């Protein structure tokens, strides 16, 4: 089902996605414990994820949400870091990906800060870091994040203490 199209670094679309990654790095209150110590990334590859079934599933729900929220899907582009990236691009998000321990209940979490999502690529709290070196701040091993299209609809505003 899923096809991955490599984007050229000379393409405006690649440069735009990279800029969103780089410009949303921030410092984290754990000093880098979960995700590592860095101010920027080395972008190695950006692939467009193509899946007709998943896309039509997404746009079908988007239209339902839009009609329940004064014709406004409230669609965002947001980061998601997860060990389950390979399952997500082939089968989509589902209830197995619900973060029971999340601060806003058992759902699927996304971040505006790329570096927030980077804290979860190796698991909750960075897990034990990369599989080869067990290093949550590994500078060697390749990581993967998703940049996702997300329908928020009417979003409940929850101020957090973070």
């Amino acid at each position: 089902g899923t096809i991955l199209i490599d984007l050229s670094p000379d393409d405006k679309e690649f440069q735009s996605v990279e800029e969103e990654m780089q410009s949303t790095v921030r410092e984290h209150r754990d000093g880098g414990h979960a995700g590592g110590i860095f101010n920027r990334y080395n972008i190695l590859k950006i692939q467009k994820v193509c899946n007709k079934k998943l896309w039509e599933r997404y746009t079908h729900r988007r239209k339902e949400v839009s009609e329940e929220n004064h014709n406004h899907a409230n669609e965002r582009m947001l980061f998601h870091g997860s060990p389950f990236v390979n399952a997500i691009i082939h089968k989509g998000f589902d209830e197995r990906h619900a973060y029971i321990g999340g601060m806003f209940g058992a759902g699927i979490y996304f971040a505006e800060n790329s570096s927030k999502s980077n804290q979860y690529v190796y698991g909750i709290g960075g897990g034990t870091g990369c599989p080869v070196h067990k290093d949550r701040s590994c500078y060697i091993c390749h990581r993967q994040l998703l940049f996702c299209r997300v329908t928020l609809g009417k979003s409940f505003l929850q101020f957090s203490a973070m």
Binding site: F104, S160, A161
Partner: protein, 47 residues
């Protein structure tokens, strides 16, 4: 998987202490996100 509050479609978690932290969002239906870009990267050691 839980539910969003009645009348809502997602939750916006907005940090109110760290003024540089951006928002985090939660959806409760897998079909409300599409994984559009797969980004392969390394973090870079500060110089």
């Amino acid at each position: 998987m839980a539910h969003s509050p009645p009348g809502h479609h997602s939750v916006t978690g907005r940090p109110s202490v760290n003024g540089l932290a951006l928002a985090e969002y939660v959806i409760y239906r897998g079909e409300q996100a599409y994984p559009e870009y797969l980004i392969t990267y390394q973090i870079m050691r500060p110089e």
